[PDB]
Amino acid sequence: AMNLVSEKEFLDLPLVSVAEIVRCRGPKVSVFPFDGTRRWFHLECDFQQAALRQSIRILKMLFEHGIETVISPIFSDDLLDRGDRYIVQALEGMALLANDEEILSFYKEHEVHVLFYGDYKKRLPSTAQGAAVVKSFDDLTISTSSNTEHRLCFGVFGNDAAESVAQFSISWNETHGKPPTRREIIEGYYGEYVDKADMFIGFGRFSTFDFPLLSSGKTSLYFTVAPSYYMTETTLRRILYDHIYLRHFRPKPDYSAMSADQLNVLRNRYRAQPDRVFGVGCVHDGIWFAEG
Amino acid sequence: AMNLVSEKEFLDLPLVSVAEIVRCRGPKVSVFPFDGTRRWFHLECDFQQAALRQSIRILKMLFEHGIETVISPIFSDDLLDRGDRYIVQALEGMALLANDEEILSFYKEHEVHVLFYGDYKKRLPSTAQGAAVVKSFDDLTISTSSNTEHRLCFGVFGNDAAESVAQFSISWNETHGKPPTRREIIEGYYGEYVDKADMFIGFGRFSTFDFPLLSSGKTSLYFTVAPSYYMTETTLRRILYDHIYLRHFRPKPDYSAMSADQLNVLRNRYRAQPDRVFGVGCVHDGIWFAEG
Ligand SMILES: C/C(=C\COP(=O)(O)OP(=O)(O)O)CC[C@@]1(C)[C@@H]2CCCC(C)(C)C2=CC[C@@H]1C
Ligand SMILES: C/C(=C\COP(=O)(O)OP(=O)(O)O)CC[C@@]1(C)[C@@H]2CCCC(C)(C)C2=CC[C@@H]1C
């Protein structure tokens, strides 16, 4: 009923039809970090009110396609560029995610529950503004608590949770008398239970990041050439289709039942190009581009 | 002195020359899981004595190229195919990694310290053979403890350490009085301290796995078309070169200092192919192949 869909049909289907398929076949959890943002700016040219827009646009796209939970890493530890202006403008962006007008409408409009994960509480400056963002985060997380249609997790310094898990477990054992389950551990870092990530949509260099405890061999990885904001309707559907129907294809192969020619034709697909590799690139104006 | 090396020269350099470069520029830690093994068999055709060989060959290659630590996931939780023969032959393979002759020579020959990580102790069957492997693992880890030239970590059910970290931390706090440092936590899971992974060399489908606490945005990802054992001298060097010189290229870009044509030529590199994505593939005889 659902497995008979072709790529062509999938790409021609109405939005609400694709959503129903994703709701049933997944991906249930998708990691979409916002990359190539500054660059994106010195292209097509304000800014924060723009990046914000594109963020809302892409998030809107992802949720309207059936995806329930979107893990979106936004701030990395490399944040300490030392420029207080860089830090001040960063916290300003963090402020919009919880104080902005249209974005709050977005949450209410599409019933989205917002969560924040990372070592931001420990890392954020012990100043007025910084402490305000933390309260804003805590406030929002509870403000949208009533929304159950979609879930959004923002990564603020969420590179490695190891030490965080250690302290969480030590406290949990202290009050409970026994160690927490994996489920409980995940609820402690993300605030709520989240399933492993089904796919990671990156950009440029082949690399994943900022989604602790939610990675597995079953997390399909994708890397667009153009930065995140450049994503189109087509690109997404092709990514979804590959994940749902192609990644884990069934029935599995059966060599002991194939002709000597098929096995022969297959071996060629490999030995044809002996040194074929995906991930190696070339640089143009300081920007890395994947070859092939 | 070291940054002036071209790809061509790098590919023509003697083995010992490449090693000296890797020893200095890295990668210090590389994750190389052995994929496409069964398939590989119904190709070019015994078995265990072969897979073993190729494993030793590739490991030999990696270490002779300057790489100090190789994280190699070998067994995944999907192991419970239920077939006791499948499990019995699996433990047989695990036995070779610690009882084999030539492989032990390999460790002594190239001064390699072997370590095992994963939830194998809890997951391995409470039987005679299984308990023997565990003792073999523990025995080997200490037998090669004197070797300090290279380090090898085998992943046996090392998909997620969360719960493991929880219990480790609860015990550590119990005996020490305070929570363990990230360093200490890593020493507890891998047995010894290991730096983040510098690169992951996979195969086929774009996906990473089985190297907990050692992943970061700086872990260069690579995906060969042919299975692991198919790797050649060329492929490796091209992967190393891309990582060392191309991945994190410097000096970083400067848009506010480029001509309006360069920025224009750059924008084309993206808008030229608007829906370009790496990770989407096609299936041929049940086997997924990356497009592009
Ligand atoms: C520092 C920065 C981009 C740097 O990222 P590089 O990847 O270093 O940019 P390049 O490499 O393309 O030069 C902007 C921060 C951040 C979080 C902003 C913050 C305020 C607007 C908001 C939409 C929230 C937003 C969304 C995402 C973007 C990453
Ligand atoms: C189960 C198996 C391969 C299945 O892996 P798929 O990826 O399912 O194979 P495909 O997908 O290519 O059909 C063999 C196990 C294992 C660990 C063997 C075990 C004994 C020889 C030793 C060299 C140690 C060894 C090395 C690596 C290989 C994964």
Curated annotation (Swiss-Prot), chains A, B:
Cofactor(s) listed: Mg(2+)
Alphabetical list of InterPro entries matching this protein: UPP_synth-like_sf (IPR036424)
EC number, UniProt record: 2.5.1.153
Family to which this protein belongs: Belongs to the diterpene synthase family.
Domain of life: Bacteria
Protein role: Tuberculosinyl transferase that catalyzes the condensation of adenosine and tuberculosinyl diphosphate (TbPP) to generate 1-tuberculosinyladenosine (1-TbAd), which acts as an antiacid that directly protects M.tuberculosis from acid pH and physically remodels M.tuberculosis phagolysosomes. In addition, acts as a phosphatase that catalyzes the diphosphate-removal from TbPP to produce both tuberculosinol (TOH) and isotuberculosinol (iso-TOH).
Listed name of the protein: Tuberculosinyl adenosine transferase
UniProt catalytic activity: tuberculosinyl diphosphate + adenosine + H(+) = 1-tuberculosinyladenosine + diphosphate; tuberculosinyl diphosphate + H2O = tuberculosinol + diphosphate; tuberculosinyl diphosphate + H2O = (13R)-edaxadiene + diphosphate; tuberculosinyl diphosphate + H2O = (13S)-edaxadiene + diphosphate
MF annotations from Gene Ontology: transferase activity, transferring alkyl or aryl (other than methyl) groups
Organism: Mycobacterium tuberculosis (strain CDC 1551 / Oshkosh)
Subunit structure of this chain's protein: Homodimer.
Keywords, sorted A to Z: Transferase
